[PDB]
Subunit: 231 residues, 3 copies
């Protein structure tokens, strides 16, 4: 484990995702509202999945070597197995908050799968220049997601209860800022141009992951928007 | 790329799926009917997924070598990753058109997963004679799907609006004819008996894919069956 | 095939899953109740999936070698591909029986995916002591599932029709007893401590699989709880 300088950030990430999972699990014990139960189930699964994948990276299972640039490059593939399941769950939290229609939910989840799937292909591609073709396709899929979150959901939240509109607006802004950083870290990190070393890259993804999952969840599960209007 | 004679058909397929995706995306911009939005989302995702997998084959990522018959045989595995997601989406288009019940939808999607999954196992199997055992199981799963589309959905469409009944009947006939060709191309192509060479096999799958996805989508999204009855 | 002593139990399992699939398929022909159709579709898919994965193990495709303990250990990875899809389908049978809320269904299916996913990682892990870390995480996920089936569903079934309450109680008890045996067989078998040899381990999993899928299905599909109350 300790033979890799980035191990400290993988261990911290593992701990923070595990602690986040347990807090949400305990906090959700005393909840019977069927609407609130939906948000607790979605939001608790997110850091639980991330916990297992951070642990796999810490123990060395989620790491492979990819030859490109005449070098064997360490690629943590477990990140994409994490994101494949956690990013659509996070979008479902937002879509259920605004009572989005089914067709829009399917478009979001499908574009998200394309985003993560093409990012994985780009991470494992051995022809250096082709890695950035996949990065560009994946980034186009992300821009579609961000467009929908702004010019489809925002207008839908305003016609909703005030507390669900204000909570959505906050979580929307958090998501757009944090998610946009991921393609940048990829491009300048060891998967892309190799400007930033792997140990610093790992620290950046850990800050982003914890903020986008545990920070996101703390804002959502403390809001009254997750409960139905009741007397 | 150009070192493979089949590259021209992979490049054409990539272009036609990309163009198809963009047309459906633009055409769906001016749509607010929640029913129509469902069909546009399903139908636009189909060629978008196929685009990415054709590109992976063009660039050489979606290709592996499988030893059988005393030879290293080029097997494009990316086809099955495509079909795993696009064939159930196409069946969902048909099932939603006739307002099929949930139990029937699950049976269709499950049989479809078995069809594609066993076809993938057959494509990667190293014992030559066993490849055709998997082909037979996969073909049995397809025949179940075709039976349901005829002796379960057809009777359901007649009790529906006339425009949804006539549109379903057309898309049903297109699907049964085109899908039935796939097991035949597999059997006589490089995955099976090896009668037809890979470059011709690739041309045939490209014609079938574009017809079953973009041609299918053009018929559906030009129909009024996708809109609810409104004044 | 016959070069492996466990082949006899893989062949028996294949036959019993295939026969089970055909019986459920025939029995479900004469069913039009939309509620009953749901249970028949879920319950017939379970042994059909298991059939294909037992066949892959029989023919040698679903087997790999994992080095640990200074030895190349035969690991049947196809079991986890089976369980990944069949265990959530079995939980869906139970959840639909008691009309569970959506949030609870998602929590069950998500915990089940974590259970199977971490068990697969543990089966393929090359550092011997780490294999049991994954076993423990997977077992914690199972205990969560069992808790929900007892202290969330049981109370919900009592407020239901008497026949659905008594049928659920029976299937609940069958599930908790049979599922609990799996982590024990893993721990003492070739994936874990290696006390029980592989051929005996394979026999035990076959008895458990057939009971948990075909036996489970025979109890459910003979009950009147799967039909709506009708005159
Ligand atoms: C009902 O809706 C509320 C349940 O949602 C919340 C239910 C959760 C979604 C269930 C998923 C958690 C499982 C219990 C998994 C247990 C293993 C975890 C990875 C444990 C990690 C923390 C600890 C080991 C440090
Ligand atoms: C509606 C939305 C959900 C739609 C989703 C969008 C999606 C279509 C976007 C594209 C996804 C696609 C790129 C997934 C590729 C997975 C692949 C990286 C797995 C590893 O295989 C890659 C190479 C080794 O580098 O295999 C070496 C050769 C091996 C012999 C490969 C044989 C196994 C194949 C991988 C079998 C295909 C399985 C499916 C891809 C499983 C789904 C994986 C997940 C990442 C989507
Ligand atoms: C709301 O419902 C309508 C949206 O459906 C339609 C929405 C679509 C389903 C969203 C999926 C498309 C994404 C925007 C993916 C973008 C990358 C594409 C693969 C681009 C391919 C064409 C071009 C690069 C040649
Ligand atoms: C309700 C419906 C959706 C049900 C679906 C029906 C489905 C059950 C039908 C059978 C599907 C099954 C054959 C999928 C097999 C995937 C497999 C080809 C992936 C590549 O692995 C094959 C060998 C190399 O040749 O791995 C070499 C050895 C490696 C060490 C393998 C270890 C990884 C395992 C593959 C882990 C299992 C992952 C799941 C199979 C992922 C789903 C893939 C998709 C193709 C279903
Ligand atoms: C409508 O709801 C009822 C259909 O459910 C029941 C429908 C089933 C869920 C459909 C799935 C079965 C498919 C027909 C697959 C056929 C291949 C099987 C694996 C055959 C195995 C048995 C035989 C080959 C020994
Ligand atoms: C809501 C719920 C459904 C959530 C589900 C819970 C889930 C997150 C729990 C953890 C699942 C995770 C451990 C799955 C790992 C699959 C992995 C074993 C496949 C084989 O790859 C392992 C190594 C060889 O030993 O690959 C060698 C290196 C290769 C180069 C690997 C590159 C391919 C990657 C495997 C791509 C990721 C694909 C996804 C993991 C596909 C889903 C598989 C299924 C088992 C979940
Ligand atoms: C909890 C994890 C989250 C919210 C991860 C989000 C990840 C992304 C938005 C990743 C995007 C990428 C691109 C847009 C292209 C480059 C490759 C990716 C996958 C890093
Ligand atoms: C857009 C792609 C489509 C509609 C693909 C359809 C593919 C099939 C219907 C494939 C069927 C197969 C068999 C029936 C057995 C032989 C292997 C397959 C997977 C080619
Ligand atoms: C039809 C198959 C069924 C119902 C299989 C159930 C399997 C389990 C409940 C497996 C559980 C495991 C653990 C709890 C940890 C050890 C590894 C597993 C996956 C065997
Ligand atoms: C979206 C965030 C990207 C900003 C990356 C900042 C990295 C600064 C760290 C110093 C770079 C290390 C280079 C010298 C080793
Ligand atoms: C009462 C609110 C705080 C509860 C404690 C939460 C502990 C989980 C770890 C959170 C750290 C990361 C927060 C986002 C920066
Ligand atoms: C379902 C369509 C299958 C028909 C295949 C027709 C192939 C004819 C092309 C000529 C065969 C090439 C053999 C000589 C190289
Ligand atoms: C107005 C209808 C035609 C629009 C142009 C569609 C261009 C997408 C490519 C379609 C070619 C394949 C059609 C099926 C044979
Ligand atoms: C949950 C069931 C686990 C019980 C396992 C009993 C196995 C007894 C078979 C004899 C053990 C073989 C050891 C000598 C070869
Ligand atoms: C009339 C009920 C029996 C029908 C025959 C079922 C045959 C399928 C194989 C069942 C054997 C396994 C039963 C569970 C132990
Ligand atoms: C194995 C991959 C299957 C999933 C394909 C994605 C489409 C799923 C459609 C689900 C239809 C709704 C069923 C109720
Ligand atoms: C990782 C594979 C999980 C999918 C298994 C297929 C069954 C899914 C059941 C979904 C139940 C409906 C939830 C609302
Ligand atoms: C185009 C939709 C408007 C909202 C999206 C904001 C774009 C942020 C740019 C992200 C940069 C990634 C490289
Ligand atoms: C048996 C259901 C009737 C409709 C299915 C038509 C069968 C077409 C044969 C396809 C040939 C594939 C080898
Ligand atoms: C803790 C929830 C109560 C019901 C679960 C029964 C636990 C059975 C123990 C299984 C042993 C697996 C190692
Ligand atoms: C080795 C660098 C080659 C540059 C390729 C950049 C491709 C980016 C595509 C974005 C449209
Ligand atoms: C090398 C050819 C061996 C023939 C096997 C055919 C199997 C087909 C099974 C269809 C029932
Ligand atoms: C080689 C045996 C090492 C023992 C590790 C046991 C780990 C079990 C963790 C359960 C909390
Ligand atoms: C609940 C605390 C979980 C912390 C265990 C993971 C941290 C790795 C320490 C080496
Ligand atoms: C929108 C046009 C997309 C065409 C790019 C793919 C074709 C491959 C050319 C080499
Ligand atoms: C319907 C009977 C299915 C039996 C075939 C599988 C058994 C393997 C025999 C070698
Ligand atoms: C993106 C930063 C999240 C901050 C988490 C703190 C929330 C406390 C209510
Ligand atoms: C299967 C052939 C499809 C033909 C596509 C043309 C549709 C234009 C309306
Ligand atoms: C767990 C044992 C199941 C027994 C199956 C027999 C059911 C006949 C109704
Ligand atoms: C009005 C809410 C502002 C939230 C933005 C937070 C950016 C990290
Ligand atoms: C909408 C604000 C985008 C912020 C992008 C930050 C990328 C590091
Ligand atoms: C009555 C519609 C006929 C459609 C069949 C088209 C076959 C390619
Ligand atoms: C229902 C007509 C089937 C046509 C099969 C064509 C196979 C090449
Ligand atoms: C295995 C075939 C079953 C025969 C019919 C059983 C009575 C519905
Ligand atoms: C009251 C029903 C008892 C069922 C338990 C069966 C254990 C195999
Ligand atoms: C609730 C009874 C548990 C039985 C466990 C059996 C494990 C072999």
């Amino acid at each position: 484990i300790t033979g890799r300088p980035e191990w400290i950030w993988l261990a911290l990430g593992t701990a923070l995702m595990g602690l986040g999972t347990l807090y949400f699990l305990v906090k959700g014990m005393g909840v019977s509202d069927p609407d609130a139960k939906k948000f607790y189930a979605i939001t608790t699964l997110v850091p639980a999945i991330a916990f297992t994948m951070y642990l796999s990276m810490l123990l060395g299972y989620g790491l492979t070597m990819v030859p490109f640039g005449g070098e064997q490059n360490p690629i943590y593939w477990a990140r994409y197995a994490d994101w494949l399941f956690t990013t659509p769950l996070l979008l479902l939290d937002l879509a259920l908050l605004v009572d989005a229609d089914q067709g829009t939910i399917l478009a979001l989840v499908g574009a998200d799968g394309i985003m993560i799937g093409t990012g994985l292909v780009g991470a494992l591609t051995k022809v250096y220049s082709y890695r950035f073709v996949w990065w560009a396709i994946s980034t186009a899929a992300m821009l579609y997601i961000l467009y929908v979150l702004f010019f489809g959901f925002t207008s839908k939240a305003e016609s909703m209860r005030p507390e669900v509109a204000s909570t959505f607006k906050v979580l929307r802004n958090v998501t757009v800022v944090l998610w946009s950083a991921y393609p940048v870290v990829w491009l300048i990190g060891s998967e892309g141009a190799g400007i930033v070393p792997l140990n610093i890259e790992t620290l950046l993804f850990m800050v982003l992951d914890v903020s986008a999952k545990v920070g996101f969840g703390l804002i959502l599960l403390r809001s009254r928007a997750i409960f139905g209007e009741a007397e």
